[PDB]
Amino acid sequence: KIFKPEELRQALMPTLEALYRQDPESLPFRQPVDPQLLGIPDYFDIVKNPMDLSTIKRKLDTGQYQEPWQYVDDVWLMFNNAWLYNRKTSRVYKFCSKLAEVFEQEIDPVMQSLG
C-alpha cells in the first residue's frame, strides 16, 4: 500500500485543522518554539525534537509523510513535548490536554479508514 501525498492530505488535513480551530488552546502550538521570545531559556536542555502545528502542516502540504502513522507520531510528539516541559498547573499544559482530547476524537475514524 503506497500512499500518495494528495491522498494523505485529503484524509489527514481535516484532523490538523480541527486543532487550529481550538481558540485559544492552539495558540501556543501554532509556530515553532522560540525559547528567547517565550522566556524559557532551558527549553532545549529538556526537549530535543521540537514540533509544532505549522511544521506538521508544512509536511502535509509538501508530501513529507509516506505513511499515516508518521503524521500521528508528529502530533503526539508535539503534545508529549509540552507535557514534558510545562508544569501540570500551567496554561500551556492545560491547553495541550484540550488539543489532545480533540485529536483523539478526530483521528480515530480517519485511521480506521486508512488502515
Ligand X SMILES: C[C@@H]1CC(=O)Nc2cc3cc(c2N1)CCCCCN1CCCc2ccc(cc21)OCCCNC3=O
By beta carbon distance, the residue nearest ligand X is 39
Within 10 Å of residue 9's Cβ, how many Cβ atoms?
A: 17
Write the interaction track for ligand X spanning residues 5-34; mark x where CB under 6 A is met and - where it is not.
Answer: ----------------------xxx---x-
Nearest by Cα to 53 from 88, 13, 86, 93: 13
Closest approach of Cβ 86 to ligand X, in Å?
Answer: 5
Single-letter residue type at 110: V
Which position among 6, 39, 89, 104 is part of the footprint of ligand X (CB under 6 A)? 39
Please tell me whether residue 57 adopts helix, strand or coil conformation.
helix
Write the interaction track for ligand X spanning residues 68-97; mark x where CB under 6 A is met and - where it is not.
Answer: --------------x--xx-----x-----
What angle, 0 to 180 degrees and rounded to 10, lies between the N-to-C axes of helices 68-85 and 53-62?
170
Contacts with ligand X: how many residues (CB under 6 A)?
11
Closest approach of Cβ 32 to ligand X, in Å?
Answer: 9
CA dihedral 82, 85, 88, 93 (to 10 degrees): -20
Summarize as ranges the residues that interact with ligand X (CB under 6 A): 27-29, 33, 38-40, 82, 85-86, 92
